Design a protein around this nucleic acid. Structure first.
Ligand SMILES: [Mg+2]
Ligand SMILES: [Mg+2]
Lengths: 127, 106, 197, 61, 122, 167
RNA sequence: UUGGCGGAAAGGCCUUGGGUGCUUGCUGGCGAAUUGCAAUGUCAUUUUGCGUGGGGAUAAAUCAUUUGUAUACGACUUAGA
RNA sequence: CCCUGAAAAUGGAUGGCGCUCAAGCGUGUUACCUAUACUCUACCGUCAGGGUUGAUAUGAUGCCCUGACGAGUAGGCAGGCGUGGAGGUCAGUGACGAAGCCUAGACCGUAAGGUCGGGUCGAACGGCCUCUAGUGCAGAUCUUGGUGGUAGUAGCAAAUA
RNA sequence: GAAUACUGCCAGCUGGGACUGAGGACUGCGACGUAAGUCAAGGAUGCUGGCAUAAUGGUUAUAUGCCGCCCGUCUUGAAAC
RNA sequence: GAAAUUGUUGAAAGGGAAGGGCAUUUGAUCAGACAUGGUGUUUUGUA
């Protein structure tokens, strides 16, 4: 039901992890650049981890798009949901994590009436 | 009869490689019978199937196929280069593989 | 082309045969090499004995048990020359080397099978006439192999049995060739001759 | 590899779109960039470049 | 936890060489076993199909004393106590059967092949 | 609000494609395919079987028949890239194949609801087959061993090199 | 099924007799479709378990005790219906 | 060309196996293998040169067209991500569950990071425009606190029992 | 008196194979046509089949082939005994 | 009620370390698209 788009390509689908985050527990795997003077990762030796750079950037016709073909838009209530009334084929709503269930049923009902896609229509639901 | 083979046997030799860096995207195939690039030019564009077995039945069969094709000749001795949809798993170095006669020009 | 290829090792050169056979195993052909005591090495017997003594000197100093093992049988000498040409320390190398078995003489699994040769490793086709060569069985029994004469006696017995086989085979094929010649020059024979058979 | 005879990726070094946040000045440079683009008179280009200038490059007259 | 303990013939039962007789641990464990059997008969269990289904030991907070070392130094002398828990259950019959339905997906060529086999044989 | 807004929304109108320049010229078949040629089916259900080629159809397919009396291959269409044109030639003049076309073979496509959990032939198709094959076999009876040749299957033996074989 | 031969890793090779099936050596009759224009289109052998129903046989080792030709402990050598 | 001249200490290195009308040496002719180099194409960014205030609807720091370029320590500059607190706004979220924490579950960004689902929990917290700083850690024989391997180890043997 | 080799040219013809399909109303340069029009001329369309689900794919563990020395620091030079 | 560190259960691998990069096999696990407006009423709750 989305707008037609070219085939979505990710140039590097693997997550860039910090060197020796597997080695030490004190080293988190959020990316940091090696500024050492003898670092094999900084010197880009063969067989080491690759580094983030601008050449891995996604296509501008394809960027910020979900695999369904929409862009995620965070919503908190019905008035935030109603902003996507004329833009249903480009944006998909996502209910925020801190919305209660008795409000979530209202947002899902209004989105189903307006034809808006919700990317998480299963949070805090009881059965 | 007793034989039903409509393909040519071949062996998966290795990947395309230098002395110390290999490239899994291109595989090297020894087709039996051919010993020169001029005879190997007949087999360009032919489909190749690697046919193997697994324990878990997926869609009615325990036999899984990996498809590819011959692209060009390699060397002076009739080895050919082959590309597959997913690359060959490199434990199949020396494994048998099937070169079909289609798409035929004869 | 074959399930198992049985190579008669007599009159072959060790390095050229090993470089043929190692590539065959790495391509996935099963090879069994028989009569390993009749391999040939180019060069004088004294040169190759000196070469083996230079190899035999090499051992680990603090413990000889973990050093290089100097195997004395001709088949194990061939196995050493072939393991030098296979990358044996990987899983692919181990899987290749388990497709090979090398024997002195021709054991009873393989005495009734067909033996082949490798013409690009044959001594009479490779060496210039006049160059000197060695016999691997003679070199191996000079450096310590104990079973040169029992292999000779077993090979004499096997050759007697094989000649008894071959006399019957020759008589049968002469009968078949006689019947084929007398049943030739018929209409089916002339049609097959026109068609090339 | 290219044997570069110049510095790659260098800015032109001439100030465009002035650093001030004055909205009326931005309206004026919008009007005069239209005039410099389409009236093919050198006066409009001269005053468009003079509109970008800083305070010490605009002495009082 | 067996490095540098002595070797014994009584590990042949378990295929080991290193075995011991931790008498205090056996006393505590068999006291807990007796208490669990008492709880089982209070609950009304069979008391003949019981096997120890669960048992675990982990570390309690240490209890520290001091040790006096040469050239006037102090070191620690710590006890490592235990938390132990165990669950005895009745040994039941075979658990279950009747696995998933495993709905099959076949192409038209596979369906034609199965129909051809069913036609061509009996 | 959780997310603020986009300052500009992209337009939802889908544009038209540009006017293409890819016309369709007809297929130029290879020279070994003339009508009446004995083919070897390389793939398919009847792979390894020798059939006779009758007519080049509209969707670049070849009309073939066994004949059905010989090897049990019915009137069918095959792909030209999945056959081998042998040098063996019979004449198919005297067969009226202009009845068959692309609409003659229709599958009557199945709905998604009709799922075959566990588990027929057109009478028009069966007397069309009976009309054509009795005209083919009269041409087959002239040269000897063609009925046996068409009944036998094709297979590669040990030592057969297809780059050296002539068909 | 009869008779041999084979110990290098024999475990296979040859042979006698009858039974039974096929024979494309030659000539006929019937069948095949629809897997829809291809999709390995599934035919091999390796190990184990559980059922049947048909044979076959009814043990030891270790701990503990003991010995001292042995021994740091294990291990070893002995004995004990 | 080969040989003598030509003697060193762990066992040993044309890289190894090995190679003798070579798989050696001199020389010539072809074919072949492959670098992040060259050619073509796509995409990302940077720089440069241009087009485009017309009406409707937005963003003129926008949109679009064309070409070239991309290594980098010390160092410089730019655009961004994250934290505590402050002004404004969303009449924002929340005991029908805020914050925190766990999660080889999902999505977005080249990345710093952001979002969602599930579990636990119990009272406050967030988006955007700005302001401010005691604002981002792997190291400093860093500071405080906690915990390992060593390890059931060294050992618990003077003063007759 | 010829041929052929060698080298070079053709805005000569033609067969097989591989990778790519960016762009998105029209505008331009052309070609074949008397014309209507058509075209391989400023970037891929037409026909058909199977599946519509973990099948493709993503993630993660393992296996295999090849590669990969421990980080930070001073230093001309660090994996550094 | 985090981490270091530990116990039990489950899964996996292991011939002198382990860990990593590219690629694929195998096992496990998982998201998305699958309605669409539509000639049409073969219609019930008659629109
Ligand atoms: Mg970490
Ligand atoms: Mg003390």
């Amino acid at each position: 039901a989305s707008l037609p788009h070219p085939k979505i390509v990710k140039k590097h689908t693997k997550k860039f992890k910090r060197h020796h985050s597997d080695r030490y527990h004190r080293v988190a795997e959020n990316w940091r650049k090696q500024k050492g003077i003898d670092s094999v990762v900084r010197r880009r030796f063969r067989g080491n981890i690759s580094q983030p750079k601008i050449g891995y950037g996604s296509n501008k016709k394809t960027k910020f798009l979900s695999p369904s073909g929409h862009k995620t838009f965070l919503v908190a209530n019905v008035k935030d949901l109603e902003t996507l009334t004329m833009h249903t084929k480009t944006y998909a709503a996502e209910i925020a994590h801190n919305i209660s269930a008795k409000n979530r049923v209202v947002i899902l009902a209004r989105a189903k009436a307006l034809g808006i896609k919700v990317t998480n229509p299963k949070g805090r639901l009881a059965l | 009869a007793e034989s039903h083979r409509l393909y040519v046997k071949g062996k998966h030799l290795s990947y395309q490689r230098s002395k110390r860096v290999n490239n899994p995207n291109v595989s090297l195939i020894k087709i039996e019978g051919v010993a020169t690039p001029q005879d190997a030019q007949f087999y360009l564009g032919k489909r190749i199937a690697y046919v193997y077995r697994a324990s878990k039945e997926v869609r009615g069969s325990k036999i899984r196929v990996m498809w590819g094709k011959v692209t060009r000749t390699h060397g002076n001795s009739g080895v050919v280069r082959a590309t597959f949809r997913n690359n060959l798993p490199a434990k199949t170095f020396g494994a048998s593989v099937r070169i079909f006669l289609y798409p035929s020009n004869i | 082309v074959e399930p198992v290829v049985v190579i008669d090792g007599k009159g072959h050169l060790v390095g050229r045969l090993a470089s043929v056979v190692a590539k065959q195993l790495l391509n996935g052909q099963k090879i069994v090499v028989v009569r390993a005591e009749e391999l040939n090495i180019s060069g004088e017997f004294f040169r190759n004995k000196l070469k083996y003594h230079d190899f035999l000197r090499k051992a680990t100093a603090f413990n000889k048990t973990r050093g290089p093992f100097h195997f004395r049988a001709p088949s194990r000498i061939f196995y050493k020359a072939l393991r030098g040409m296979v990358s044996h320390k990987t899983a692919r190398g181990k899987a290749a080397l388990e497709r090979l078995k090398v024997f002195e003489g021709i054991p009873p699994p393989y005495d009734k099978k067909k033996r082949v040769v490798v013409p690009q490793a044959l001594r009479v086709l490779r060496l210039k006439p006049g160059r000197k060569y060695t016999t691997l069985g003679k070199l191996s029994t000079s450096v310590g192999w104990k079973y040169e004469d029992v292999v000779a006696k077993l090979e004499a017995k096997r050759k007697v049995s094989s000649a008894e086989y071959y006399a019957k085979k020759r008589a049968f094929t002469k009968k078949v060739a006689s019947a084929n010649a007398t049943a030739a020059e018929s209409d089916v024979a002339k049609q097959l001759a026109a068609l090339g058979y | 590899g290219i044997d570069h005879t110049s510095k790659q990726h260098k800015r032109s070094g001439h100030r465009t779109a002035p650093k001030s946040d004055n909205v009326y000045l931005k309206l004026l440079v919008k009007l005069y960039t239209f005039l410099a683009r389409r009236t093919d008179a050198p006066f409009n280009k001269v005053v468009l470049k003079a509109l970008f200038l800083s305070k010490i490059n605009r002495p009082p007259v | 936890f067996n490095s540098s303990i002595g070797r014994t013939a009584q590990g042949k039962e378990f295929g080991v060489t290193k075995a011991r007789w931790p008498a205090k641990s056996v006393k505590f464990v068999q006291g807990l076993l007796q208490n669990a059997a008492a709880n089982a008969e209070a609950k009304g269990l069979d008391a003949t199909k019981l096997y120890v289904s669960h048992i675990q030991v982990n570390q309690a907070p240490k209890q520290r004393r001091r040790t006096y070392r040469a050239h006037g130094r102090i070191n620690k002398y710590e006890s490592s106590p235990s938390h132990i828990e165990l669950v005895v259950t009745e040994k039941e019959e075979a658990v279950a059967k009747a696995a998933e339905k495993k709905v099959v997906r076949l192409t038209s060529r596979q369906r034609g092949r199965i129909a051809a086999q069913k036609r061509i044989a009996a | 609000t959780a997310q603020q807004a986009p300052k500009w929304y992209p337009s939802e109108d889908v544009a038209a494609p540009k006017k293409t320049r890819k016309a369709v010229r007809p297929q130029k078949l290879r020279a070994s395919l003339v009508p009446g040629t004995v083919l070897i089916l390389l793939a398919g259900r009847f792979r390894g079987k020798r059939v006779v080629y009758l007519k080049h159809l509209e969707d670049n397919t070849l009309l073939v028949t066994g004949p059905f009396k010989v090897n049990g291959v019915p009137l069918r269409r095959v792909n030209a890239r999945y056959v081998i044109a042998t040098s063996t030639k019979v004449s198919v003049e005297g067969v009226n194949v202009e009845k068959f076309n692309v609409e003659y073979f229709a599958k009557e496509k199945l709905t998604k609801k009709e799922k075959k959990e566990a588990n027929e032939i057109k009478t028009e198709r069966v007397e069309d087959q009976k009309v054509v094959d009795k005209a083919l076999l009269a041409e087959i009876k002239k040269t000897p061993l063609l009925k046996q040749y068409l009944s036998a299957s094709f297979s590669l033996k040990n030592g057969d090199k297809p780059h050296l074989l002539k068909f």
